[PDB]
Amino acid sequence: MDDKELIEYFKSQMKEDPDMASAVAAIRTLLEFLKRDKGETIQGLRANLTSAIETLCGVDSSVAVSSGGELFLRFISLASLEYSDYSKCKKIMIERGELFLRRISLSRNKIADLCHTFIKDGATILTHAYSRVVLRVLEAAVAAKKRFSVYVTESQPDLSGKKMAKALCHLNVPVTVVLDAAVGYIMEKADLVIVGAEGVVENGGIINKIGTNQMAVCAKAQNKPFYVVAESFKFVRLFPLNQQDVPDKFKYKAEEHPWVDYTAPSLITLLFTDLGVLTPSAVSDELIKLYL
Amino acid sequence: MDDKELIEYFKSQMKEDPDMASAVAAIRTLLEFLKRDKGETIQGLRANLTSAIETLCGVDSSVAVSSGGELFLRFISLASLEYSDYSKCKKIMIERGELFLRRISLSRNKIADLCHTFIKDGATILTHAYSRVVLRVLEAAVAAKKRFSVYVTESQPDLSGKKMAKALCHLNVPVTVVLDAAVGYIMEKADLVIVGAEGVVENGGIINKIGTNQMAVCAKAQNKPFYVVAESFKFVRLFPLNQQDVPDKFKYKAEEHPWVDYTAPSLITLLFTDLGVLTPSAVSDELIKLYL
Amino acid sequence: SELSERIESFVETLKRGGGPRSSEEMARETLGLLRQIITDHRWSNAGELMELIRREGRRMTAAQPSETTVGNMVRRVLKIIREEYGRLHGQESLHKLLTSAQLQSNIIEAINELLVELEGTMENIAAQALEHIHSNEVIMTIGFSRTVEAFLKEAARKRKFHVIVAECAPFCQGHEMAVNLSKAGIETTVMTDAAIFAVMSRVNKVIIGTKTILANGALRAVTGTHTLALAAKHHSTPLIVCAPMFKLSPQFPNEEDSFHKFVAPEEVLPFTEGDILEKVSVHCPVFDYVPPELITLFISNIGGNAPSYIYRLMSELYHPDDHVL
Numbered sequence: 045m046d047d048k049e050l051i052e053y054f055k056s057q058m059k060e061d062p063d064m065a066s067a068v069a070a071i072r073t074l075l076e077f078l079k080r081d082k083g084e085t086i087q088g089l090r091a092n093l094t095s096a097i098e099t100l101c102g103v104d105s106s107v108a109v110s111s112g113g114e115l116f117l118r119f120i121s122l123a124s125l126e127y128s129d130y131s132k133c134k135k136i137m138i139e140r141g142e143l144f145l146r147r148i149s150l151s152r153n154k155i156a157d158l159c160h161t162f163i164k165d166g167a168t169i170l171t172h173a174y175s176r177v178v179l180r181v182l183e184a185a186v187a188a189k190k191r192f193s194v195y196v197t198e199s200q201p202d203l204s205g206k207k208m209a210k211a212l213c214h215l216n217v218p219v220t221v222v223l224d225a226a227v228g229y230i231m232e233k234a235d236l237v238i239v240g241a242e243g244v245v246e247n248g249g250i251i252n253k254i255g256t257n258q259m260a261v262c263a264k265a266q267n268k269p270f271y272v273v274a275e276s277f278k279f280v281r282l283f284p285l286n287q288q289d290v291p292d293k294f295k296y297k298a299e300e301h302p303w304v305d306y307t308a309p310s311l312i313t314l315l316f317t318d319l320g321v322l323t324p325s326a327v328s329d330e331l332i333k334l335y336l
Numbered sequence: 337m338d339d340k341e342l343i344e345y346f347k348s349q350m351k352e353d354p355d356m357a358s359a360v361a362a363i364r365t366l367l368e369f370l371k372r373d374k375g376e377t378i379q380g381l382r383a384n385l386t387s388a389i390e391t392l393c394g395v396d397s398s399v400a401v402s403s404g405g406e407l408f409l410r411f412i413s414l415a416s417l418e419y420s421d422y423s424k425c426k427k428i429m430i431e432r433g434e435l436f437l438r439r440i441s442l443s444r445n446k447i448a449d450l451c452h453t454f455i456k457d458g459a460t461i462l463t464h465a466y467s468r469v470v471l472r473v474l475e476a477a478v479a480a481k482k483r484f485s486v487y488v489t490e491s492q493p494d495l496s497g498k499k500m501a502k503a504l505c506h507l508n509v510p511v512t513v514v515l516d517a518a519v520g521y522i523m524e525k526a527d528l529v530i531v532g533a534e535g536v537v538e539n540g541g542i543i544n545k546i547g548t549n550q551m552a553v554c555a556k557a558q559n560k561p562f563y564v565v566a567e568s569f570k571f572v573r574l575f576p577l578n579q580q581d582v583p584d585k586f587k588y589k590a591e592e593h594p595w596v597d598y599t600a601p602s603l604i605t606l607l608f609t610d611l612g613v614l615t616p617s618a619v620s621d622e623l624i625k626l627y628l
Numbered sequence: 629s630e631l632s633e634r635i636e637s638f639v640e641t642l643k644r645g646g647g648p649r650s651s652e653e654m655a656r657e658t659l660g661l662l663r664q665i666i667t668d669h670r671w672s673n674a675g676e677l678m679e680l681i682r683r684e685g686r687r688m689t690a691a692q693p694s695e696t697t698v699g700n701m702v703r704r705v706l707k708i709i710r711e712e713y714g715r716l717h718g719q720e721s722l723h724k725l726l727t728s729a730q731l732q733s734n735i736i737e738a739i740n741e742l743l744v745e746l747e748g749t750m751e752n753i754a755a756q757a758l759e760h761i762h763s764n765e766v767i768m769t770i771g772f773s774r775t776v777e778a779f780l781k782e783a784a785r786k787r788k789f790h791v792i793v794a795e796c797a798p799f800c801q802g803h804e805m806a807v808n809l810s811k812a813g814i815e816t817t818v819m820t821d822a823a824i825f826a827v828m829s830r831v832n833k834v835i836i837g838t839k840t841i842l843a844n845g846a847l848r849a850v851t852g853t854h855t856l857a858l859a860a861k862h863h864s865t866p867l868i869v870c871a872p873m874f875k876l877s878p879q880f881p882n883e884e885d886s887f888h889k890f891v892a893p894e895e896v897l898p899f900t901e902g903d904i905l906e907k908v909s910v911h912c913p914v915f916d917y918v919p920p921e922l923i924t925l926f927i928s929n930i931g932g933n934a935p936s937y938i939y940r941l942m943s944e945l946y947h948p949d950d951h952v953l
Contacts, residue, residue: 225516225547255517617936
């Protein structure tokens with residue numbers, strides 16, 4: 045199977061379901077490519093899989109795609125750990141990939157059925173950009189018949205904030221669009237700031253939309269709670285020391301306009317993943333446990 | 337004149353010399369109104385002046401106009417105390433106002449001469465939006481044959497950061513325009529921060545464009561100095577307690593779009609005024625001495 | 629003539645090595661020298677006297693900009709001439725903006741009373757010292773400075789407490805304070821710099837001297853003072869600075885970066901190392917810059933003050949025109 049066919053497969057999988065996460069589509073593409081490969085050697089599988097990983101990363105420079113590819117390759121190694129034969133290995137690959145795909149499909153609802161308990165009635169919600177996870181947890185909170193105010197920033201590079209405002213008005217929720225430079229002026233009226241995560245670094249810091257870091261710093265200044273929601277597959281074995289240390293393959297192609305910022309774990313109150321509610325140390329624990 | 341030559345004359349003074357601040361134009365218009373007063377009473381003179389204050393505040397409601405009006409009111413009261421007869425005190429009002437205009441017309445040059453020393457060679461300055469005082473200070477620094485870089489935010493509500501970037505690159509200075517949301521990303525490269533001010537509150541905080549506070553807060557997180565350049569006439573006896581305490585006639589009218597916010601004095605390192613280089617606590621003293 | 633050669637000897641002593649070690653001696657000598665300058669040199673108007681004083685002070689400051697007692701004493705004298713001329717012939721603020729040949733004896737008596745009041749600054753500081761030390765306190769100092777040693781060794785006449793002194797490496801002169809103060813029965817301790825933070829949790833308050841206090845409230849002190857102030861701020865322990873009034877100088881931190889004073893690297897690294905001394909660059913500054921945010925209080929011969937008020941003392945000591953000198 046050729047790289048081009050992989051590219052249209054990925055793009056079609058994206059377009060058919062706009063609600064699907066990018067990493068989910070990437071994992072599905074990798075699983076389909078593994079399904080039709082006709083390889084014989086596990087090493088041949090690894091080389092082709094990683095090459096397709098860089099191909100998709102070139103297609104989409106998101107951190108989620110690279111994290112999903114790394115998780116996929118570690119899954120390949122885990123499956124091949126205790127299968128000397130290759131055919132049994134391949135069948136287990138397919139079945140465990142089906143289970144993995146269905147679980148990551150249910151992961152968003154799993155996060156929603158747990159995160160909504162923190163939304164105090166009458167509180168104020170602050171969000172940065174168009175994140176599907178925060179929209180789902182707000183839907184869950186509304187389903188529980190709770191009332192709350194929502195402020196959303198505009199995310200200057202691409203105005204996803206207005207799109208989220210439209211999607212929230214579609215659910216009859218009081219929402220207000222505010223400028224990206226007014227976060228501090230709004231930070232006094234907030235009660236808790238929930239935000240999605242593009243990716244999660246080793247110690248619990250978050251790779252996310254460029255405006256996240258200043259909002260986190262301002263919230264820490266006012267000692268307001270700061271909650272971040274992300275899925276399991278967004279974990280990654282990266283570790284920047286500051287904003288500069290972030291690899292350039294994630295900053296751009298997505299004077300100077302980086303699309304990505306890094307937030308330190310010291311400014312994060314809690315994380316909401318399908319595993320549960322986690323301290324920032326739990327992410328590092330999971331990454332350590334996964335890699336022996 | 338009566339309510340029609342006021343606004344037209346003020347706009348003419350602003351437009352004929354667009355490189356001259358609103359407060360100076362307002363003070364000059366008040367002096368012109370005093371010249372053509374054609375009335376003989378000190379109480380009536382001050383009543384007409386204080387009415388002119390808000391008929392000018394109807395347009396360009398920035399805090400500088402109100403500060404200049406309050407200064408003019410205090411000046412005319414001070415003069416009255418000194419003398420006794422409206423007849424004789426009129427000419428002395430006129431001459432004192434002429435001398436006041438002459439003294440305040442050199443504020444930019446005095447501030448530039450005082451503040452050019454604070455820029456290092458190879459430094460990296462950070463700026464929020466357009467402010468002629470900052471431009472003059474950087475021109476003075478260039479005249480001192482210095483080498484540095486300048487990062488400027490774009491000031492999303494009205495893209496004046498691009499305007500000042502153009503005016504600065506006209507001077508052959510390496511500049512870089514960044515998003516309002518990228519401040520937290522960018523300042524780690526910045527060596528220090530210099531901003532203007534549209535008004536100085538009692539304690540020492542500033543009253544500036546919407547994004548300024550964020551920078552200041554982030555600056556306190558990064559342990560970087562934060563310098564504010566502003567003239568003497570930008571002082572006012574207003575003390576906001578928080579962001580919502582500043583009067584709403586300044587926030588709006590140049591789904592929730594304010595235009596001006598407040599920065600606490602604790603985040604300010606030094607004030608660079610035509611009165612000298614002051615600590616944030618100094619201003620109150622001066623403003624106390626005006627009313628004792 | 630004779631005054632000129634005395635001035636040259638003073639300048640040479642400053643350039644080579646400070647004879648009179650105490651800063652108070654520097655202030656007294658500078659004021660006396662200005663006294664003979666005023667009495668001897670001839671002048672008709674005050675302007676020529678002021679410019680002559682400017683020239684002489686420029687020469688003395690250029691002899692050694694590291695210490696500024698001479699400079700701000702000269703500035704105080706210049707303000708004295710300005711005040712006397714204004715009095716015998718006739719402050720920047722918003723109020724000013726909105727509103728608008730026998731002085732030699734007066735100058736001499738002003739300098740004389742300035743010397744008289746300068747004599748007792750240490751005694752006044754000692755007199756007010758007792759109100760900031762309570763029983764069984766824990767005090768930490770740095771380096772050597774006679775003001776704080778007099779402070780503590782007189783305030784212990786009626787109180788009992790513990791004192792920790794950190795040696796100011798490489799010039800381990802904190803040992804001198806330790807010995808002198810233990811010769812008064814204070815139960816002192818001798819410590820290295822590297823342990824400051826290690827013990828900083830168990831200290832109630834920290835009292836230090838200084839070499840020069842800038843206009844913004846930031847000061848220049850011995851090396852390692854900035855680390856001690858940072859540790860104090862981290863543990864939120866109050867920081868007291870004992871400085872007489874003449875150690876207040878009106879310059880600002882960013883001035884040509886001729887702020888520190890670099891001495892021979894022999895103290896830090898002995899010459900006996902040998903070959904490795906070529907590829908290795910060694911720096912031995914003797915002064916550190918403490919920002920005003922880490923300072924809690926200022927104790928002077930006039931009383932207690934806050935750093936945020938320091939600017940006002942600048943207006944009462946130095947005219948704005950004489951900052952450049």
